Design a protein around this nucleic acid. Sequence first.
RNA 1: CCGAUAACGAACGAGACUCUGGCAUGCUAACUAGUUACGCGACCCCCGAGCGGUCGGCGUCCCCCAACUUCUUAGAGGGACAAGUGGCGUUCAGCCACCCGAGAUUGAGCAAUAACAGGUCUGUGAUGCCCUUAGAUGUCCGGGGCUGCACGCGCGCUACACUGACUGGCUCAGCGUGUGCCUACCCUACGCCGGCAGGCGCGGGUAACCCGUUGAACCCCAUUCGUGAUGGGGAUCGGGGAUUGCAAUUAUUCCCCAUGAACGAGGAAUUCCCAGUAAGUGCGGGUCAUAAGCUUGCGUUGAUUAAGUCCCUGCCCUUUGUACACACCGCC
Lengths: 145, 143, 104, 171, 55, 75, 189, 121, 72
Amino acid sequence: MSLVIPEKFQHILRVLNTNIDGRRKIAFAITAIKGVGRRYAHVVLRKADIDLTKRAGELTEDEVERVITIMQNPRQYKIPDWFLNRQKDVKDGKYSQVLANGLDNKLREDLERLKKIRAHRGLRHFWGLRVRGQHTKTTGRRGRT
Amino acid sequence: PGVTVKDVNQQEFVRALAAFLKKSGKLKVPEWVDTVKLAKHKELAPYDENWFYTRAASTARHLYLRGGAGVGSMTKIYGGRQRNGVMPSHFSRGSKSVARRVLQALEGLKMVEKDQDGGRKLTPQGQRDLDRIAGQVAAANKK
Amino acid sequence: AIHRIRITLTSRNVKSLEKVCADLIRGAKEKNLKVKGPVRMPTKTLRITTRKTPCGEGSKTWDRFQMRIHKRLIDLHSPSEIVKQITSISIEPGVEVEVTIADA
Amino acid sequence: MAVQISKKRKFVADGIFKAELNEFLTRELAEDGYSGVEVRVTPTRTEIIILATRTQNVLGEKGRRIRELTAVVQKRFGFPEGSVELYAEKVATRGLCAIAQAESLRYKLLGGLAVRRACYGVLRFIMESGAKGCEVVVSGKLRGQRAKSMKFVDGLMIHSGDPVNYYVDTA
Amino acid sequence: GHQQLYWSHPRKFGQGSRSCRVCSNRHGLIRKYGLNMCRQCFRQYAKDIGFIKLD
Amino acid sequence: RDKLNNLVLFDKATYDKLCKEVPNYKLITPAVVSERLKIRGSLARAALQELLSKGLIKLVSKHRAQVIYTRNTKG
Amino acid sequence: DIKLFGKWSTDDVQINDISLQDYIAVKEKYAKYLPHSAGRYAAKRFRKAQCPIVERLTNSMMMHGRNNGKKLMTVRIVKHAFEIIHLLTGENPLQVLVNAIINSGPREDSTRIGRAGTVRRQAVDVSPLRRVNQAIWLLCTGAREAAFRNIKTIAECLADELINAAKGSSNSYAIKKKDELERVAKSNR
Amino acid sequence: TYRGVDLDQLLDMSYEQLMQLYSARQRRRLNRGLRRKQHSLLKRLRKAKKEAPPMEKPEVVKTHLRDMIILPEMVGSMVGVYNGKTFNQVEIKPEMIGHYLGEFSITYKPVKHGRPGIGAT
Amino acid sequence: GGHVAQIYAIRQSISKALVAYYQKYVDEASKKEIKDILIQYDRTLLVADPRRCESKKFGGPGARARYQKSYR
RNA sequence: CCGAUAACGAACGAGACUCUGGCAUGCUAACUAGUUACGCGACCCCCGAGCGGUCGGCGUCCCCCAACUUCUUAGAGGGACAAGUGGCGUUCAGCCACCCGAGAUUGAGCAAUAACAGGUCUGUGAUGCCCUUAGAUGUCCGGGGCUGCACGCGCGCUACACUGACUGGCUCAGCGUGUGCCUACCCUACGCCGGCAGGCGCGGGUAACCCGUUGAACCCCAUUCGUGAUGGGGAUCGGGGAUUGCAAUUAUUCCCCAUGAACGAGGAAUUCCCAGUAAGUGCGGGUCAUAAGCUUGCGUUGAUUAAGUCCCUGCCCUUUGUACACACCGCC
Ligand SMILES: [Mg+2]
Ligand SMILES: [Mg+2]
């Protein structure tokens, strides 16, 4: 605690396919991963039995791969069902947490599916408009002009 | 020198009560302590691990202060300020099940009993426990 | 019975309630029943605020309306019977009277 | 109790009942010199008192019309039968009743009298009944299509403060 | 139409369930204290009900 | 005035730098420690409480948002 | 005896210039244990003269929307900054405050309506009350925009603002602005 | 594939066990009582689908009601959803189940902004 | 009340109760030669501040402010 | 208002008035408010206090079975009048300072003549005239629309952060509402289930009896963070779960998990405001089957500046000038 910088302290890490700032706290470093938020980080760290008050760069490989393994399949790790992102999938109806660019391509394929079935929400997405029924008369002029 | 809980600062008093509750650990800690938020309006889980012991100690202190407080009562104490994002803020109450489970754990240690009316209060031996801890923390803060 | 009754008096004004609360208790003392002291409940104040305009065009003037409701509680308790003894009401229009019993 | 509403709604319903009764008697007793209505309420029964100039006119043949209106109010607000009584009270100093003088003027103008002479006569009568002041305004399509308003006023007439409430009557 | 569509459309709640107790209008009603009266009619009759002005 | 790149963890040239002259001047705050030692500031607080426990820095204020320290008296 | 904030006796503090000693209220007749009072000092003209300047600093410090009721936080700020300046200097914080008020009071200013020569048409010397008020306002402004977007907290900014104003070092916002005002006034003589 | 199950199982998937597969709003919708309008529309599609020629799509049926949720038993029908002016025919694909009928009959045509007039001087 | 107004009420009540106790159960000499220090130290310790609030009006959000007006 | 005075005598407005708030240990009363005392108790000290301390624990209008209104309530009353002092003043009207006083200017409501082609015929079984009146401009039902977006404007809210954000602990309100003639629709305690959004049973309250002692927010105390578009910021957008209804899609609303976009304090211009005021801060009512970024009020924290001016915008009186009189947005 408050020692010199550890010798195996990389300043940034490589998680899945993305890089995270090891200078910041682990509870907030992995929030850099898309699909990972502060609550998700908090719960995976608490059930990872990892001290929260240490930075990401001072971890070791076993700890970080435990974190990765929990994140990839948190169903078996007592993470409650309702806490997840991709619950009750539209393709296969299986409860899953999404962690990376799988989120990006899944969002993309959901939008193109909405367009293909020609949903009103999908058509709004196609035209770049608001889909939640907000007022477009006066607001959001920046995104077009 | 008779010492009541009203004569010592309640903050470190409830902290010492939580510490005693931790070290005299017999609690019915639910399995969902590590995950859930403490309220609708709270936006993070509590930072400390054994927050449950602290909250149960606070509920004990409140039932010492006044009796008959139901679950909705406790959430009324444990309410908080919902910032509600871009809309103006408001007031939001506490978690019903968290308070209920704390209470159930409180009669798990038989320091809390229900009233003849609705709600629950402290038992005389729980009052004794609180008073002993108050006297000992008074001795600690004085000496 | 042996009867212990409760009488409430309420209206919009204060003067009529005062004169009723005076003449009734005076009649009771003349008719030797001991009287529980006159209890004035907190005044109801119905506040209603409304735009003065019937159009909505103008300088946004809101008119406010008040209806002060005053109510008094006086109890008649006697060793003897009450209702067979006292029957006269002496009630002006505008004031409401309701007579209840201890069991009520 | 559960059947009986609270005090507030009770006073509100009383005010609504009074306003509806007054408005109905206005629309119905317009020509009979209607002046005002007074209701005296007891839990045993209620008493309705109507102030009008022509009591002999508001009462029908052997009290036919007063019976008619008693049945009307009986069936309208749904009183228990025989719990409401209709008393007609002949007003004193009809020149002071703003409502009655307004109705007499309106009757005169609908008759076709000259509005100038009708206003002068009504004002003279009101001041002859004895008053510390009077003021009448006629507004509408006088003369041509353009709207004009003629106000005839004499004597003292305050406008402001509390005392205008219990010194000046408005119709 | 017949009985099955002339008044079949539900109005057991909402603005269309209510009308002014005086002028039968559906705008500016005051449902406070069960008044059920239009705003303008409330202005017209507030003396008669007894709501007077103090402040 | 672009970026401060404050140090989150101590290194050798700054650890001894903290050790050898910090308890010498009158004012000791996390603010001054961070600003004259180019460290993050949570690190500053941690170092200050460690030096407190070691006992070579005297506490006066200990406020939740504004903690002030002084060196121990000379004499 | 009074010992504002539990220490820092008020008797020893001395007012150097007779120019503002009728408007500084640090003396035992105006010394108070704690700078908070519903003193109704705004009710009348010149009632702020009897108001202690510690209270004036506390009232003046809470500004800018986020701070319009946050008075006790300002009080704790004043107490902490007094702690800090006593530690950095060793003397009575109140004497530092008094000297800072003395040196931050701009002696003359310019104001008029017509065609500006440089900024205002005439140069006018000021009353002592305006000196005190403007000195306090300048000090609070200097602390506020000293601590805006930096890790150095508000207490230290207030502390070193008062220390620099107590001596005069051109490192404080207050006397920098005062010198600008004096230059403007002398040019617009 | 709606929730991992195939279409044919969805055909014989009765309401009560299907409400779990539906989202929250649709589950509330089936939990509340279906009215005679929905049942009449279902009967009309069933009659048309059975009288539909083999290897050939059925005839079109129109309807004002667009709050009808799509059932897997209507996949491949010709339904005419009113747009406020006309009834717009729409295919029922095997992925449209958790969708309203009105989500595919747009109520307005898109906006192509012409030159603004005297306003916004 | 709130917190600080509550504090002021308590301290005022302490001062007033002490001077009443000194006026009644002992001589007014002690009463007056504590009342003097109480007066020329803090008048509010014995006399309440009559100000409470001010009624909001229908032309502005607060007691004296008004909603922002624009001309164009 | 005093005064002069071809005026005299009046009248409205203003003032006056009503409410409101501020002091009343003075009166009246108080089990739908309590205070004090006592007795039961519970617990700490019991070394020893023991008339030690707490209790929002229970009783003493359960009728003989304690007193009292300080607190609370609301009525009668009182109280402030430029009343006293000093000064200025024609020594008249009156003005300033000071004492004593709760208060030496508490805010509102009401509010004159004459008008405006200002607004409302979409409030009316208020209405003239005109239009339509069975393929109805009446009226009903179904659906859409009133939200639709290259852009402009206004009132607002959120914010740009360390005077902060998060996590926990401690801790203080007042206004006012609450079950329906039609009219179905109340405010809610407590217990259980669920993590939250909710649901499941038992009650209370038609009300100073219940919600409720309205355990509000801000604030206060400790934790982490550390100057980064960062733990600020939460718009967009996905999945899922709840309530209202007949219906939630162009998402009603609420909730969980994801996304952290502009924004680093804002030009030319401009709004409001002098004390419990601005501002922060929450809370009630109105709209409500579902509901507030609005509004009406309420309370909490709580200032800087000023006791002056006509410079800007105007307002009022006298004199003056006019070629204006639809009245300088004139006329020419
Ligand atoms: Mg007036
Ligand atoms: Mg964060």
